[PDB]
């Protein structure tokens, strides 16, 4: 219980931690119904508005006013933000020319540049195009400071998961806020935007910036504002805080704006009605900057202007209804809209039949505007599976569409129209969902554009800007060093844990009883005394050094004319297979007599090899090769491609994808990019946590054997950023794209897979694009260790995501 009888006198927006039975006066008390009885009259003053007027200059101080224009206001930090402009002939910050801030210029008493995070809800990246015509203050931050053309949010692209991601550097599956609404089957409770439940700390995991700061003895302003506090008051409060005594003043502040999200929902992202909301946000920014200038802090503070997600054209007319697919939608609960999450309406209902539901939801309309996934089958880049609050059954919705349970849930007006024309929440690589980032201040670079990056990266950077050590998170610390003038983070290469063996030719064909047969032989190669020696293999095919193995295991480096690989004696297959394909490379066939050819590898003991018998006996599982016979450099070299040490288990369904990739796409990449270097390999993620499985976690083997089946196959395709130089002779920055393809028994994901592979395989691969960094997590390997670039540049490269938008 809170004793509301107390008073907020001399306590307004106090940074003091106060709890029951004492009443509060902080910027969140209203949200807790714990404000002292006079909080509003003493703390939310509104008299005379938010701006000084000529007739107010030098006034007698009336403590009833919202903000002051009296002579003493400056030293009290009470002035309306335009005080000096109206009353002292100064210029608005926005009218001042941009000037490089080479070192912080702070009043005495400031030991470090404060950080102010200015978050705008639903600010689509492309809104920035509206330029100084609409947002002159924001355009000055953007053009003069450091900006990205856009920033990638996390899925789902809604506000709660994104704001907490920004605060923690964690994926939603790790921090717990996996949606604006969610049900936790252990709590048996439902979290909603509206309601008290969300205030319960049990929902919020990880360690958000304000906690990290506090634990390390750095003072944080309040990172939450009750909706009833007008933005002008929030700004005045931050400026008031900044004027506090040296020993009370916070180092980090957060402003939040609910716009332009709401206007976007109402009017759509391209409505003429969006201009007004944008003007208002810009005005608020101008208040902050004017205020800062008044305080002599405009060349002292670092400011981050950042959005949580974008906004797409979505209207009532574009709603799919589950009732068109399912017989009883009244027995399920659906988290709806721009994503779908499905569970039984009655928790734990025994009659719930997810296999039958998914079957009815799979490719049943030719223009179907969503796709069902068991969560473990969602593209790995989304990192949306490892949490009990994430339903097993998910619907990825097509941009511009909604999914609903039944037409009852949709409310057309007499106009046949809906009240909303905008929404968001879709796949985070969708263009419309991209949001904004600008950094401005002494620690950021001047007039610099940086490539787009993910919002999970910012937590490390804000820690850097505040001299803090970040809690464990999903950012890659250093990948954003290029945004900063100073306070960069010097990364260190992870230490290799397992050294490879380099087995020579040791066994005889006679030693092998694996059930493998090859109808032909290359007897010439038996005469090559230096067969499979290093030679020039590593320098042609392993361009960026061997991947470091970062866990305890036993593996062999194997050399070949056309490829090199790191063969695991434990998983019975390569951890990685690396090869270079030149722009002019020739594609050839697998000779008919070699169709079913598999050859024992005399470098590796029979006990550490797969056996073809398992494959012959398993009527569902077939096999493929990591280095493709199609790209052999000669008929003689092609024999290497059929070694049992190049073989991996693949469902025929998957082989349709993989063969198209091996035979058609790699060459196409080489042709388009002036040669490519390829590293491919297996991934084991049976418990869908985005991390390499230990042996105990692998749950499927080839029939009758201990050959483990990968849940995915990866490929990393590198070339020279400067496409005029061949991949193998590159002098500068690299260009990379990667994939993590799901290894599945069918192609149900691909509604057109009945057609030729040229009609559907690439579409599938684009959906499963990935960062090299994703693959590192899933494999425990570390790539690009030997290059001519800085470690920081490599880190950036590893976080790159080729989105194909
Ligand atoms: C993204 O980055 C994060 C952070 O580094 C990585 O997540 C970490 O993964 C490691 C390795 O598996 C886990 O280590 C295990 O930790 C457990 C117990 O740890 C407890 O205490 C820690 C530290 O105080 C705390 O962070 C953990 O919090 C989890 O559980 C809370 C209560 O349920 C929950 O509120 C919170 O959201 C978080 O849940 C998430 O993680 C758990 C697994 O712990 C998972 O089941 C859940 O679905 C969420 O994903 C926890 O109380 C030890 O017993 C083990 O021995 C082991 O050391 C870390 O716990 C985990 N940290 C966090 C915050 O998630 C991700 O792997 C990385 N992702 C990728 C793809 O790289
Ligand atoms: C709730 O708050 C009010 C105001 O703080 C408390 O009223 C005071 O009670 C003390 C103790 O009897 C008196 O000496 C003061 O005169 C009261 N203050 C005023 C301004 O009237 C009240 O006691 C609190 N209720 C509790 C403690 O449960
Ligand atoms: C999947 O869709 C089929 C229709 O294609 C549904 O089949 C109906 O089944 C009910 C009994 O469950 C029958 O009375 C109807 O005659 C069937 N419809 C038709 C037109 O064949 C089936 O119910 C759906 N299953 C789920 C899980 O929703
Ligand atoms: Ca795993
Ligand atoms: K088979
Ligand atoms: Na299909
Ligand atoms: Zn919204």
DSSP secondary structure letters along 455-519: GGGHHHHHHHHTT-PPPS-SS-TTTTGGGBSS------PPPP-BPPB---S---GGG--S----S
Sort 308 into a burial class: Cβ within 10 Å, 0-12 / 13-18 / 19+.
buried
Residue ID of nearest Cα to ligand 3 atom 16: 327
Q: Where are the alpha helices (DSSP H) in 169-218?
A: 172-175, 209-215
SS3 116: strand
* Cα–Cα distance for residue pair 769/771, rounded to 1 Å: 7
Running DSSP on this structure, what letter comes out for residue 273? G
Determined by which method? Answer: X-ray
Of 236, 92, 799, 704, the residue nearest 491 (C-alpha): 799
Backbone angles phi, psi at 260, to 5 degrees: -90, 15
Cα 475 to middle of ligand 7, angstroms: 25
- List the structure tokens of 231: 């933005």
* Cα–Cα distance for residue pair 613/606, rounded to 1 Å: 13
Question: Quick one: which H or E segment has residue 136?
Answer: helix 136-144
Rounded (5°) CA angle 53-302-293: 25
SS3 429: coil
Residue 5 Cβ contacting ligand 2 at under 6 Å: yes
328, 351, 355, 360, best to mutate for ligand 3 pocket (most atoms within 8 Å of CB): 360
* Cα–Cα distance for residue pair 92/88, rounded to 1 Å: 11
User: In sequence order, what E strands does 274-387 have?
Assistant: 302-307, 312-313, 319-321, 332-335, 339-344, 370-374
Strands lying side by side in the sheet with 115-121 = 252-260, 115-121, 302-307, 437-440, 146-147, 448-449
Backbone angles phi, psi at 576, to 5 degrees: -160, 150
1, 2, 4, 5, best to mutate for ligand 2 pocket (most atoms within 8 Å of CB): 5
Which residues make Cβ contacts (< 8 Å) with residue 368, sequence separation at least 6? 320, 751
- List the structure tokens of 92: 């608005």
User: In sequence order, what E strands does 412-462 have?
Assistant: 422-423, 437-440, 448-449, 453-454
Q: Contact at 8 Å (CB) between 734 and 718?
A: yes
Residues β-bridged to residue 501: 556
- List the structure tokens of 12: 């307004």
* Cα–Cα distance for residue pair 69/53, rounded to 1 Å: 8
Cα 709 to middle of ligand 4, angstroms: 13
Q: Contact at 8 Å (CB) between 771 and 784?
A: no
Of 287, 291, 373, the residue nearest 744 (C-alpha): 373
Of 106, 67, 62, 69, the residue nearest 85 (C-alpha): 69
Q: What is the DSSP string of 686-750?
A: TT-SSSPPPGGG---BSTTS--BPPSEEEEEEEEESSTTS-GGG--S-EEEEEEEEE--SS-TT-
- List the structure tokens of 625: 């090769």
Q: Contact at 8 Å (CB) between 731 and 725?
A: yes
Residue 323 Cβ contacting ligand 3 at under 6 Å: no
Give the rounded distance of the alpha carbon of 789 from its chain centre.
24
HEC letters along 735-784: EEEEEEEECCCCCCCCCCCCCCHHHCHHHHHHHCEECHHHHHHHHCEECC
Which residues make Cβ contacts (< 8 Å) with residue 472, sequence separation at least 6? none
* Cα–Cα distance for residue pair 451/10, rounded to 1 Å: 47
SS3 642: helix
- List the structure tokens of 488: 């960069």
Tell me the CA end-to-end span of the chain in Å, nearest whole number.
54
Ligand nearest to the CA of residue 753, numbered in listed order: 6
Rounded (5°) CA angle 428-465-486: 105
SS3 446: coil
Which residues make Cβ contacts (< 8 Å) with residue 646, sequence separation at least 6? 563, 565, 574, 577, 625, 626, 627, 640
Task: List, by residue number, the catalytic residues.
Answer: 159
Give the rounded distance of the alpha carbon of 406 from its chain centre.
32
Which residues make Cβ contacts (< 8 Å) with residue 308, sequence separation at least 6? 119, 120, 121, 122, 123, 153, 159, 162, 163, 166, 435, 455
* Cα–Cα distance for residue pair 170/474, rounded to 1 Å: 5
Q: Contact at 8 Å (CB) between 241 and 284?
A: no
Of 544, 574, 792, the residue nearest 676 (C-alpha): 544
* Cα–Cα distance for residue pair 277/320, rounded to 1 Å: 31
* Cα–Cα distance for residue pair 719/727, rounded to 1 Å: 5
CA dihedral angle for residue 131, residue 137, residue 139, residue 143, rounded to 10 degrees: 160
Residue ID of nearest Cα to ligand 2 atom 28: 3
Backbone angles phi, psi at 487, to 5 degrees: 65, 20
Q: Contact at 8 Å (CB) between 165 and 171?
A: yes
424 annotated ligand binder = yes
* Cα–Cα distance for residue pair 471/459, rounded to 1 Å: 9
Sort 68 into a burial class: Cβ within 10 Å, 0-12 / 13-18 / 19+.
buried
728 annotated ligand binder = no
* Cα–Cα distance for residue pair 64/74, rounded to 1 Å: 17
Of 260, 264, 255, the residue nearest 280 (C-alpha): 260
Of 280, 294, 286, the residue nearest 240 (C-alpha): 294
Ligand 2 atom closest to residue 5's alpha carbon, by position in its atom list = 2
Q: Contact at 8 Å (CB) between 532 and 505?
A: yes
* Cα–Cα distance for residue pair 63/46, rounded to 1 Å: 11
326, 327, 331, best to mutate for ligand 3 pocket (most atoms within 8 Å of CB): 327
Q: Contact at 8 Å (CB) between 631 and 587?
A: yes
- Domains along the chain with CATH numbers: 1-44 (4.10.410.20), 45-90 (4.10.410.20), 91-489 (3.40.720.10), 490-805 (3.40.570.10)
- List the structure tokens of 97: 């020319």
* Cα–Cα distance for residue pair 372/185, rounded to 1 Å: 21
* Cα–Cα distance for residue pair 70/351, rounded to 1 Å: 72
Rounded (5°) CA angle 685-687-690: 50
464 annotated ligand binder = no
Residue/partner pairs of 743-746 with CB below 8 Å, 24 or more apart: 743/650, 743/651, 743/654, 743/709, 743/710, 743/711, 743/712, 743/713, 744/377, 744/651, 744/653, 744/654, 745/620, 745/651, 745/653, 746/651, 746/653
Residue 359 Cβ contacting ligand 3 at under 6 Å: no
513 annotated ligand binder = no
Cα 5 to middle of ligand 2, angstroms: 7
Q: Contact at 8 Å (CB) between 658 and 739?
A: no
650 conformational bin, left if phi > 0, alpha if psi -120 to 50, beta if neither: beta
* Cα–Cα distance for residue pair 404/493, rounded to 1 Å: 48
Residue 356 Cβ contacting ligand 3 at under 6 Å: yes
Placement of tokens 């559907």 in the chain = 760
Question: Quick one: which H or E segment has residue 283?
Answer: helix 275-294
- List the structure tokens of 470: 């970040």
- List the structure tokens of 240: 């008031």
For the chain, how big is the Rg over CA atoms in Å?
A: 30
* Cα–Cα distance for residue pair 48/66, rounded to 1 Å: 6
* Cα–Cα distance for residue pair 391/358, rounded to 1 Å: 13
Of 558, 555, 561, the residue nearest 575 (C-alpha): 555
Residues β-bridged to residue 738: 716, 770
* Cα–Cα distance for residue pair 686/692, rounded to 1 Å: 9
Q: Contact at 8 Å (CB) between 300 and 105?
A: yes
Backbone angles phi, psi at 45, to 5 degrees: -60, 145
Residues β-bridged to residue 115: 252, 302
């Amino acid at each position: 219980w809170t004793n509301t009888s107390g008073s907020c006198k001399g306590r307004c927006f106090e940074l003091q931690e106060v709890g029951p039975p004492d009443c509060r006066c902080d910027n969140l008390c209203k949200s807790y119904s714990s404000c002292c009885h006079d909080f509003d009259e003493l703390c939310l003053k509104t008299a005379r508005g938010w701006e000084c007027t000529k007739d107010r200059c030098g006034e007698v101080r009336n403590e009833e006013n919202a903000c002051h224009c009296s002579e003493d206001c400056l030293s009290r930090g009470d002035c309306c933000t335009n005080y000096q402009v109206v009353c002292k002939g100064e210029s608005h910050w926005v009218d001042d020319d941009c000037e490089e801030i080479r070192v912080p210029e702070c009043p005495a008493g400031f030991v470090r540049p404060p950080l102010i995070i200015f978050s705008v809800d639903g600010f689509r990246a492309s809104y920035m195009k509206k330029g100084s015509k609409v947002m002159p203050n924001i355009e000055k931050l953007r053009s003069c400071g450091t900006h990205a053309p856009y920033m990638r949010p996390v899925y789902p692209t809604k506000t709660f998961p994104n704001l907490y991601t920004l605060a923690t550097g964690l994926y939603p599956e790790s921090h717990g806020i996996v949606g604006n609404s969610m049900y936790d089957p252990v709590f048996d409770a439902t979290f909603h935007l509206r309601g008290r439940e969300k205030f319960n700390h049990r929902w919020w995991g990880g360690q958000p910036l304000w906690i990290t700061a506090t634990k390390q003895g750095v003072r944080a302003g309040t990172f939450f504002w009750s909706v009833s506090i007008p933005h002008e008051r929030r700004i005045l409060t931050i400026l008031q805080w900044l004027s506090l005594p040296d020993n009370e003043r916070p180092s980090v502040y957060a402003f939040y704006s609910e716009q332009p999200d709401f206007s976007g929902h109402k009017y759509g992202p391209f409505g003429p009605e969006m201009t007004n909301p944008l003007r208002e946000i810009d005005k608020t920014v101008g208040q902050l900057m004017d205020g800062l200038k008044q305080l002599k802090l405009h060349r002292c503070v670092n400011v981050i202007f950042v959005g949580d997600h974008g906004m797409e054209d979505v209207t009532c007319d574009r709603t799919e209804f589950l009732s068109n697919y399912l017989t009883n939608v009244d027995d399920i609960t659906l988290v709806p809209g721009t994503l779908g999450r499905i569970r039984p309406k009655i928790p734990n209902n025994l009659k719930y039949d997810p296999k039958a539901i998914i079957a009815n939801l799979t490719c049943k309309k030719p223009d179907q505007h969503f796709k069902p996934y068991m969560k473990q089958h969602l593209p790995k880049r989304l990192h949306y599976a490892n949490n009990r609050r994430i339903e097993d059954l998910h619907l990825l919705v097509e941009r511009r569409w909604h999914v609903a349970r039944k037409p009852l849930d949709v409310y057309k007006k007499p106009s046949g129209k809906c009240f909303f024309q905008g929404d968001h929440g879709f796949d985070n690589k969708v263009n419309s969902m991209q949001t904004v980032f600008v950094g401005y201040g002494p620690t950021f670079k001047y007039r610099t554009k940086v490539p787009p990056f993910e919002n999970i990266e910012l937590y490390n950077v804000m820690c850097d800007l505040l001299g803090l050590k970040p809690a464990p998170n999903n950012g890659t610390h250093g990948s954003l060093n290029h945004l900063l003038r100073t306070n960069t983070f010097r990364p260190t290469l992870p230490e290799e844990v397992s050294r490879p063996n380099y087995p020579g030719i040791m066994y005889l064909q006679s030693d092998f009883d694996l059930g493998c047969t090859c109808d032909d032989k290359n007897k010439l190669e038996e005469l090559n005394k230096r067969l499979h020696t290093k030679g020039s293999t590593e320098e042609r095919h392993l361009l960026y050094g061997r991947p470091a193995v970062l866990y305890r295991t036993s593996y062999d480096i194997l050399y070949h004319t056309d490829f090199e690989s790191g063969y695991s004696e434990i998983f019975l297959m390569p951890l990685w297979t690396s090869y270079t394909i030149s722009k002019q490379a020739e594609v050839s066939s697998i000779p008919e007599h070699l169709t079913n050819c598999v050859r024992p590898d005399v470098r590796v003991s029979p006990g550490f090899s797969q056996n073809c018998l398992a494959y012959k006996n398993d009527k569902q599982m077939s096999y493929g090769f990591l280095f493709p016979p199609y790209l052999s450099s000669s008929p003689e070299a092609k024999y290497d491609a059929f070694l049992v040490t190049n073989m991996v288990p693949m469902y025929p369904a998957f082989k349709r994808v993989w063969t198209y990739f091996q035979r058609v796409l790699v060459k196409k990449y080489a042709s388009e990019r002036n040669g490519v270097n390829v590293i491919s390999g297996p991934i084991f993620d049976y418990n869908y946590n985005g991390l390499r499985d230990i042996e105990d976690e692998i749950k499927q083997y080839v029939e009758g054997s201990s050959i483990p089946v990968p849940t995915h196959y990866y490929s990393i395709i590198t070339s020279c950023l400067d496409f005029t130089q061949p991949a193998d002779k590159c002098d500068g920055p690299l260009s990379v794209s990667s994939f993590i393809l799901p290894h599945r028994p069918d192609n149900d994901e691909s509604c057109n897979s009945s057609e030729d592979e040229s009609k559907w395989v690439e579409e599938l691969m684009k959906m499963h694009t990935a960062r090299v960094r994703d693959i590192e997590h899933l494999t425990g390997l570390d790539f690009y260790r030997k290059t001519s670039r800085s470690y920081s540049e490599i880190l950036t490269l590893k976080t790159y995501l080729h989105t194909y938008e």
